[PDB]
Amino acid sequence: NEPHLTLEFLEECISGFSKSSIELKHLCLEYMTPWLSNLVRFCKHNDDAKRQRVTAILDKLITMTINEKQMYPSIQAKIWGSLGQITDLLDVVLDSFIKTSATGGLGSIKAEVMADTAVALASGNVKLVSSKVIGRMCKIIDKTCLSPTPTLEQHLMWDDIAILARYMLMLSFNNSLDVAAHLPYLFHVVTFLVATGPLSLRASTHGLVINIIHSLCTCSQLHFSEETKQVLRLSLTEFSLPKFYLLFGISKVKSAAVIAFRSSYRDRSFSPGSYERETFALTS
């Protein structure tokens, strides 16, 4: 019953959060969460320049998550888990994640961590985060026509597509990307990414396909007969054969998952190397 204090209250609470000790930081979390729900009115406050204020607040929140590694399991459940139930606020929140990842770069820690955070954000509204991450990817690819380049890796927007791929990879698991409505747009982008990019990025595309098929087999909205499900289950095994490793360009790799994920992604940024890249054949 006091929304107007939200803006000034939250700004101070975040500033005091950093100075507090580990034990006192937990207290800040307990009473900070209720205020978060009041940003709905302020986020669209007649564009009175108060909207710019909330964006600053979100950037501050992102910085705390990056640093508070030990308290990561609780920040997602309380801050991001609850923050993901505000439909009107999802659009602005997602943009900040993309901008934050953009500044860091493709291999930066900042972009890697924001991908993890999006999993909690999409949990509240799968139907909206899934239908909003794909739409941006389709437009970045559609904007490469303005400045044609010999190859995608040499295009200016290459980093934007690469970072957006990591977000889709994380959202694929456990049917967090709505295949039942976005399947046509998933293959369209998979074809433009197969066997393109560094070995880390090439294994990512293979994992994405493996998870899209699994979601289909474990989807309740669709009612596939038992005959059809057998074909899908066989298809899942086929894509895991060494034959497809060469097709995707990940031959000589025992497991795609190991290459796709890196354990020390919070301490240090990714260090791409071995720029020598295999070729692709349109028959593949």
Add this chain to the structure above:
Amino acid sequence: NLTSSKFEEFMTRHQVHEKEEFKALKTLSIFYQAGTSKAGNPIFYYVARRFKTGQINGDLLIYHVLLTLKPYYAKPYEIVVDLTHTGPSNRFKTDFLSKWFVVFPGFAYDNVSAVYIYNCNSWVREYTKYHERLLTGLKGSKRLVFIDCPGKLAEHIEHEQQKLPAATLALEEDLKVFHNALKLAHKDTKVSIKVGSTAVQVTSAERTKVLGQSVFLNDIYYASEIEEICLVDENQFTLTIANQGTPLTFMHQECEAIVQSIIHIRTRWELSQPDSIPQHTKIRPKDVPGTLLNIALLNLGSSDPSLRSAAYNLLCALTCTFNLKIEGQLLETSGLCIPANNTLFIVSISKTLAANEPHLTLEFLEECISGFSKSSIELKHLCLEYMTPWLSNLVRFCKHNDDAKRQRVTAILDKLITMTINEKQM
């Protein structure tokens, strides 16, 4: 390249006589000749109990049976097989069973005057169905005669000459008969229950088709093997037995009378045995379902991409093996890329399982607390997230008819208090 002549030479060439195991078979009294029958054909008695599945060499038994039948198998002979208290322990393997059809010369099979089966049970009928192909020759066999009741075999066989196993005769089925007892199960069949002095025999009152011949199944359950005796209600009682999964339920007008006798028989056994308290120290996988679930959930939020997949597959097996009910769907797979931020998914599963699976609470929390100390600083926070929902389920256990389960929760509470003292930061 095996035949009766070849097999005989190998055993004769082999020094089976001095192995000291062939002599033991004589002590075990397996397939021993006992007088004759009405027609005068020799009688043999094979005891299923005396034969272990693998503890003894299969060749030695065949030679012993062949050696005893060698002098007399030329003439017509009668063989009686004792299948009393038949169990999975005493059985013939698929490969081992086949040899009997070929090892013998073949003309002896025609000299099988008659076959008598006594105290048959359902397991044997179940075994026959699985091994029907091998036993197809015996399907609808005229030589197979089923002893529906003890009073019929004595007529067909020469009385005062039959030499059935002493242990079988010891029971004698000479105890109270609780006629008109109904075996409540997927199918209802009238069963006559006898509370024997040392065992309980359930004799079906409806004939059953075994190899195309009508017979009454007679399952026998030793009193010592009746670990649990629960009288749920006067309408029906529960009798759980070792490694039988769901217990056996029957309907009788006076269940307590049957249960009282079973308890009375069981209580006497406790005095007879020297030391019943020393036992257990062995856990079967079914016995500890909650313990496995804690390992899968604990490792699902790990930081190793190659360990999350292994935990997920283990979780998939657990639901199917134990028929766990979940909101979504799980499909076993290899090569799945599970993200590191596997936090919200784990918590949803625990809430659903906790909500509609209270009985796992006691075993779930006991394991979860023990793992809490071993877990890392970050992983300790995960243990908190999914542990809380189960705590609600203790409401029923606190007053569980003071069955000594109340003592368990007190240990759990003491464990929780210790965590608070040490986890100052949390």
